[PDB]
Point group: C5
Chain length 381, copies 5
């Protein structure tokens, strides 16, 4: 239906299609797709996995009983021993650091399992496993309808303003619809995003830049936000692609040199974006959420497929506007339906749990994104 296609074009141009992954449906449900994995470094191969288990866990009671040429693993990373008794000269008790140090000082070597053709073919060894699994799920399409284009005495007013009024009123209707869609998206993103936490939540409490705390410059938030990106980079094979925040949270707070105020509007910045940060990521401004929060996350793709995201959006078209001639008031209404969801497998161990949940159930998906993190923020007022 070309008229719905046109209304769709004129309404979705106004929504945050870029802070969610976009897919589409033609079904009562949307068949959504996504990619996930629970651990990250080196290989995912089983042959190699077994070797890791068959070499050593690197217990601190064994770290120095190793000698030149030996292998060991730690947190699944295989390393070779350079010269004898690695760590003999390292006072550090924490293996995470003792190892960090040992690598730097060339006591141990990050081990590469690239190997000859013969290794594989002769051994008839296992082969590397998947880094990620690809999921699919079906989430019902939900809708909302507006009945707002009031006509009657208004029809006369609209006729008086008839130059623009026919389409104008439909466009105004679409505008409010887009706004409600964006709110719905943001609520889901807020809900699904993992809470960002460091040492008992962002340096042992939600970041607090309140009057009684640290009304500095806004710099300490910018630092925390930058760290949120590192978290994503640490935990997933991506880099944050977008950020959303309220004005008080960052879209204004970061104005103190930590925010790039849309110097250009067609370069790495969408039309609905507020701007981007001093460290990039198009920044979107929420403006509605009472939290004055910040979200950092990833929306990505495989070829043309927007399969990577915390939230996925899939409109169901075959954005319809109608007039209902009730009484003397033949007003204009607008119906929009879409599926909105998170990858349900991030709350499931396997398909026998995924099959009894719904990616659109934001009570269950709460805090389970892993492609996004949420910063709670306390501000002056």
């Amino acid at each position: 239906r070309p008229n719905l296609v046109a209304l769709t074009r004129a309404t979705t141009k106004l929504i945050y299609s870029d802070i969610v992954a976009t897919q589409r449906t033609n079904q009562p449900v949307a068949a959504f797709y996504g990619i996930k994995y629970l651990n990250g470094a080196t290989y995912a191969g089983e042959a190699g996995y077994v070797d890791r288990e068959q070499i050593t866990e690197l217990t601190e009671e064994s770290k120095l009983t190793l000698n030149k040429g030996d292998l060991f693993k730690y947190n699944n990373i295989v390393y070779k021993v350079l010269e004898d008794t690695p760590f003999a000269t390292i006072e550090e008790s924490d293996l995470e650091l003792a190892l960090q140090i040992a690598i730097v000082l060339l006591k141990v070597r990050l081990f590469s399992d690239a190997a000859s053709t013969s290794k594989f073919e002769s051994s008839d060894s296992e082969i590397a496993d998947a880094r990620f699994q690809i999921n699919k799920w079906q989430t019902a399409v939900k809708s909302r309808k507006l009945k707002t284009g009031i006509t009657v005495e208004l029809a006369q007013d609209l006729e008086a303003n008839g130059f623009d009024a026919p389409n104008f009123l439909e466009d105004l209707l679409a505008t409010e619809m887009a706004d409600e869609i964006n709110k719905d998206i943001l609520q889901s993103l807020i809900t699904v995003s993992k809470r960002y936490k460091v040492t008992g939540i962002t340096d042992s409490g939600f970041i607090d830049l309140s009057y009684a705390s640290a009304p500095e410059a806004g710099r300490s938030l910018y630092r925390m936000v930058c760290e949120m990106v590192s978290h994503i980079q640490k935990e997933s094979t991506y880099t944050a692609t977008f950020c959303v925040a309220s004005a008080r949270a960052a879209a204004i707070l970061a104005a103190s040199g930590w925010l790039k105020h849309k110097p250009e509007d067609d370069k790495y910045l969408s039309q609905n974006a507020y701007g981007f940060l001093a460290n990039g990521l198009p920044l979107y401004c929420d403006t509605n959420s009472p939290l004055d929060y910040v979200i950092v996350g990833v929306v990505e793709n495989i070829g043309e497929k927007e399969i990577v995201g915390s939230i996925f959006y899939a409109p169901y078209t075959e954005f319809k506007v109608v007039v209902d001639p009730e009484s003397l008031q033949p007003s204009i209404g607008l119906l929009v339906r879409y599926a909105l969801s998170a990858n349900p497998y991030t709350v499931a161990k396997d398909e026998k749990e995924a099959r009894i949940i719904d990616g659109g159930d934001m009570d269950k998906m709460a805090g389970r994104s892993d492609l996004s993190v949420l910063l709670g923020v306390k501000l002056p007022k």
Copy 2:
């Protein structure tokens, strides 16, 4: 009259046509239009409103009588309860903040009323109402005449300078006309803009960067200006789109790194702009008002119609420049007429009050923009 079209273009190119919404008339009055809503969050339907009233106002006393699956609303925002007794572990006494905490801690979830198509069609439920409505009003077209192109002995001098004088003089005269028009607009904007206020005005009194206060860098003003932009975003679905300030207020004061000196003018900047801010918005400069103030506000549109602004401008053409040869002086007279107004519905409960007021009456519209805010500023004088 094509010659007036040419004079119009050669005069309006010189005024801040974008710091007001621009409409046009052909009537003795301009039929102005604009959009307003009296409150945000979620859907605007009666069904919603009823469900909200039918669940709870979240009286603090009742916050722990809530359990998993329950709904509640606060400040008209609907939330669902995640697990039992939300807020049981939140020591915060200010319910607004306790709620923000509950959301980030996933004790409660921002709730969407989206539902299946069947829900609505089967139940014959109500439908979301309009949030914003379009208002109309009529404001008289006022005018200003100049008798400034003096010729006589002056004609002789103009003849001596006859190389340029004919058109030169008309453009010069047009320039003075444009100046007065622009200034007239700015005075209206100053008057209509809401006074910016936080905790008893800009942090309990207007910003004071005087000698006895904080002759810092001007950073503290930028901060407040940025908050003004936030305020607009908080209270309306717009970001600031422009700002005007005097030199001492910001057009010079902010030139300590928070003002961009028109690096370029063929992109992202109107030709009469002084430059733009570090907060992106086109910075204009008045230079006349004794106030040395800063105004932040928004102009916008639905498709082609500039329906959003604190002040609306509507010139009436059918920029008349004629010779008035009284005595021995074939001098040039210039007449421009236009309507200029604020949306009168911002000072009315309904149309029965709007119909007895005038959007052009700045004694009534004063401080009632909602699409702009004014910052009073005390300087090192």
Copy 3:
């Protein structure tokens, strides 16, 4: 004279042609034109002025006798009274500031005299007078001449360098001529520029960044310069369009982050600019004058005519090169002539005084630009 025109093109490109206004002559004297007004706001009509006279001067003893609906004026700006006894609640003793407060708090309202067409036509009301007058004056075309293209054995040297020498030497001679001309321009500009003075000269003495004062970063000068631009905006209907400073004054001194070294050489920047500032304005540098000063001011045009400026330049062609074999030496003489002047009306009440003065008499025009100011600067030699 095409050969001289070619030299003109190749020589005037080497001077700061845009820090002064450019006009041209074809006469032994140059007829210069320019625009001035002596006090900026609202209408300049007699009706306006009379109504202002008929309402009040807003004296301290009368500001409280005003009530709702009354008008008053101050510093020629008309304001309307909002509600009774404006200023009743304002303790501020400086009436001008009290007024600024009253505007912000909506005790008074910036008032526009714009009115219906009928008001004007019915009463046969007066009309706005001109704000600015257009002046004309003439000065002699003055000249300089060189005997510097030395030839003899030099001819032999030039013959040795004969692949380039004919043109090379004329271009070189033209260059040194251009250099002195540029310097001459600066002397006139320096002289005419008004001394920037605030509270007994730029915060009660010329800015001093010497060792015994403020050997800081140069920031305090950058701030003062930006304020010089404000001064221009205050006193004239223009923003600064250029700035020139010595190395020690600002071309180097402000190069601590508030000065840019021509990052781009073809956009909004002349080929002769040293660079531009962080507060805009192409930046020029004199390098000769003992003053070590900074000048801020404006060149502006109506169509093609550079009518606005502190100094006006008007070259006279019909760059003459003459080859004269004194004895054994066919040296090259170079002659360049132009008018250069300040608008004499800045030192005159009317034509009777203008007719007995000379815009080229810099002993009278000194400090009388109003379209430019100079900052004296004490430096940490």
Copy 4:
């Protein structure tokens, strides 16, 4: 195999192909080439060497026995003596500095052995030998393989997603493969890079920005990273061309104004870069290595050949994807083979050592890049 050519070209776009030198093979081994010299100043000729030997080693007891016209050399730099007894007036006891002082004070002069041909031909002298030698080596092509494109019930899922599933799965597998390859490269770069060290390592211990040290802004890291670039400039004939770091180490840590977030994805930056430093060089973000390190180094070419690099990559093509219908699971296997190596010459004096080592042996090449340096960083964890 055109399909593999396409898969390779369309997949290697995802690895840090430019932070290594890229060469290619068609053999079971890759023939790699690279360039090295042991010292940088003046000519590398025997005649020069002898003249230097014949004048002095600049013993501090002899530094002042020199007089005007004499030559001396120090650290292979030849200097001529200006005036008598150079250093007579230099109190500095450290000859390295005393020389720097003498040079700046014009007591000595940097000397060139350039001369007329007559000098050379008459003398029948020697000529400069090569500074840099070109070394070649062969390193076996190694591989990694996936058997992860799972099909069965998954085939049904892929059919359900049949719209684009065939290529999707291959593209995804190729992506995961690219990721593993890139990891292998990074481990090799980490290993080969020399440990940056000043006065016992980065000012007597690895940079430490831990909470017990200097949790500043990240400024101090930027400084050390920048110093690593100076090291590259000092010890080679190239400037750094790239930088790679973990997120915590710098992609995020330096995003306090010392790092740019890829504001442009096609200007002095590859598509795989996270950004570029405030001081340039595309910055790649590792994200996997536990080291939290920073690497600065070079890749450079002569004509089309990327002859210079610490690590060299040489893929062996004739990204192979096949399906193996074992059981009911006809999964997609993917194999990629390439040589990866360091120039073995950096750990050898000559061919009799080079012939018993392998550029691909990272247990020997560790710390021996000379075209890269790594900074260990202790972070505020």
Copy 5:
């Protein structure tokens, strides 16, 4: 010889051809040309000079005996007296400053000798002499040669690498030649550059930012460097055009915020630039000299001729490559020759001194550039 043409054009792209003036020869010596002179303000005319002498030297004893209309001179600048007894109200005892002040306060006026046609023709007056004097000198073309193309066993390696080897080798050898040429130039620039000196050398000693002084940020060096530009501007009719410094002296030091690492290079920078400074002129880097210095200076041209430079370069061709296949060694030689020089007249009063010296004699030209200065720097090593 087309092969010399191709090799030279394709290789000199690698030397700092723009930090010297480029000229060319075809002779065994190069005929270099250049401009120097004694001062920089107003005219160079003898009659005007005499007038200066005929008015006053402005000794303080006479500064108060001057009255309205009088002229006086100081440091060859003529100034006019405004009103009587100039300086009567100036407490300053140092005439240099008293004059600076008097000019600012309009007690005196910079005097322009632009004059009427009558002045000149009536008196049949003299005419201005040259501000500049033009020199020519002849400097021998010296050669530098390489026997760097080692082939034998290497020839077989080159055959193995026959894909690239023929030209690869010549290009590489040519690259090393470019390096030596560049280094040769830099040594000459270092030597000729005048020591930047202020109050006994850059604030009474070479700038010292060492740990024993001021290990700040590097800001103080940037300030000194910017002053070096000032020096060029004060001493000559040019601004600095380029800057070269060691890696530690500026390429890295200024990374702290006063250096941009080539964010753009298809505009305003040479391909061999490191980047450019915050008060930028392309920043180049030597990487060899132990001095860790900074050079600031200027090259300039009249049409196509680079008549200005501290050092001039003039190559002589008829990059020549030869082969000497003794035994099994068909090795490649590379020969390049050029003249390199400073304007010898900077160390001569007249031709009887210039004719017995050589601009290529860096023992005599040491410290006598005047078109460049060098700063010694003590770094925090």
